[model samples]
Target: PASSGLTDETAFSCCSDPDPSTKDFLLQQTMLRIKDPKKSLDFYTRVLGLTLLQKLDFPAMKFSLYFLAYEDKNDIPKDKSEKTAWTFSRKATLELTHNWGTEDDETQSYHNGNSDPRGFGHIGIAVPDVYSACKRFEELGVKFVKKPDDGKMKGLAFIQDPDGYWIEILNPNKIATII
Candidate 1:
């Protein structure tokens, strides 16, 4: 939230001051806890075309961190020893935390912040062609909370991942039409 006095440009940019102690921050990843790693990975990598950047497994912790990025993996370093690290712009990466044995337990499930006592709404995804991408999703049997033509805001829609997380999809070029 910004103060009423803050202008549009200022609101969008980070707060700056003459003081030298101001620090800048970078968003490395957005993490989501997943019960089934195989299903979640397939959805994000196959459907979304994201590259598997890294996978850190901890047998003691019984959990694994799977990082995926929209950038080309070829450009990333090949040295696995040097943990894949980079500051990517225009591509918002995601970290999926897969806990071992959760998928086998029928009673275990992760809430995607869409049900009772909801907080986080969803993850937004921008597609080259919203309609076509949505149609592809349908063919793949992906669940949708809002279709491109079903909601009041036509073309602004949402699809659910295997973990029940909502991913808002849109075409950036035609944002005016939906808004």
Candidate 2:
């Protein structure tokens, strides 16, 4: 086989196998049912650089929700999460809503261990300089966990997102000694 034959189109077609058990249920998308979508909207749109992909209001259902997020940049080099997210999502819609709050009364606690299986724990956005990024975020009045520590286990530091979720600004491959 030639290298061109290994291209995505060629591979997809060649490896296409419809599973009989596969059911058409719902398409893949990131849905973050936030405690408060109203506040989360500004955080995601303004701070995270995501766009308001869509908004839906269903008065009949007594449920309304707005999907906001960054339209996945396919051109950007993907790591892991982005690979699957962009593969199926139109714009990586991080879901944020619920019909009745009484159904599920308990939301996640940010105290680390209390979180349910570490849901949406933190997002690590790649940046050329974590130090400067941390500084900028500090100026923005964002909660700073600590100074950027460069060594092992990925050069990153924790910063609170507008929604109070931890975010890791990192440069994992920053010429550090790879032990």
Candidate 3:
């Protein structure tokens, strides 16, 4: 348990000096399988600007994997690769499948991000400008939780991906900058 002995008049301090020992730490991909491939693909690639990672078909499973990335197009470097080599191209892949075909949405109750907190929120994305990002998102027909300039929700705003999972966008640069 953390020390709760501190008084009501509280002061806090935390610091991370960008450890050099932590090497090659990167997020590759988050694969989401949605009901509609065309809709998901268009929204992710076109609106989010995720570089396409190519779509594959598996006849036996009757599914497809559409990979996307924030990295340069098709630039999978051998040195940078750690198994499923992925880069920060937006959020990663939209692995499309028909596993839910004809099944009622009730079966997908947990996946819908509505019930008792499974994968409850969206991934955090860092952009140069949060306000501009929100503007662009609104233009793209995304349902936003709030505007960036509101400055009421602490250091973040929530938005939805194609699957309705909440995404977190924050700009620390808005708070502090060294030089």
Candidate 4:
């Protein structure tokens, strides 16, 4: 390959066959723990426009789970059990888990995995307009890791949530033009 000097002997160049039984597999959701459910919920739902699909409370475990997706409220099932099933079955959902009393504890916070000893990178959201989206984010008081015009990557931007999680904002159609 031109990008890296590797032949068939040096690298496993052949593509593996897709498993027939795993054809229905889907990457359903990414779960992140939050210190304050209220702040996180407001950021995802109010700021990002994600609809709450299901909420599960576990008093014994001292934790709660909230499932959200880009969906209309009317489109989701009203019944509790049905909604849970519907939520779990869908793809591209965001699950925020809240442990009891973390909101009140000022010192407690989740590691965003971006600073020292970095592991998790970020989640991406494809928007229609990168410039306008950055402007809207600026007005909403969202923190930015990188603006659309920042660095060598001119078209893509990165914003941080209340929990300090990075979210890459980009427009696939306009990236070529802008860059």
Q: lDDT per prediction?
A: 0.84, 0.58, 0.60, 0.89
Instruction: Using lDDT, rank the candidates from best to worst.
Output: 4, 1, 3, 2
lDDT digits (tens) for residues 82-107 of candidate 4: 88889999889999999999999999
Of 1 and 3, the candidate ahead on TM-score is 1
The candidate that wins on lDDT is: 4
TM-score of each: 0.83, 0.54, 0.63, 0.90
Task: Report the C-alpha lDDT of model 3 over 46-142, residue by residue, as the tens digit.
Answer: 8777665565566788666667656567565445344244434334444434443523354452264545655544566777777788888888789
Query: Which 10 consecutive positions of candidate 3 have the poorest summed lDDT?
Result: 80-89
Which ten residues in a row are the worst by lDDT in model 2? 105-114
TM-score of 2: 0.54
Ranking by TM-score: 4, 1, 3, 2
Stretches of candidate 4 exceeding 4 Å from the true structure: 1-14, 177-179
Candidate 4 residue pairs that clash: none
> In the order shown, what is each candidate's alpha-carbon RMSD?
4.1, 11.3, 6.4, 2.9
lDDT of 2 by residue, 127-161 (tens): 77777877777786777655576444445677765
Q: How accurate is candidate 2 locally (lDDT)?
A: 0.58
- lDDT tens digits, residues 1-179, model 1? 75579677978687566465434444667889999989999999999888887788999999998888887877666676554445233246798999899999999989999889799888888888989999999999989999998968987789999989999998999898866
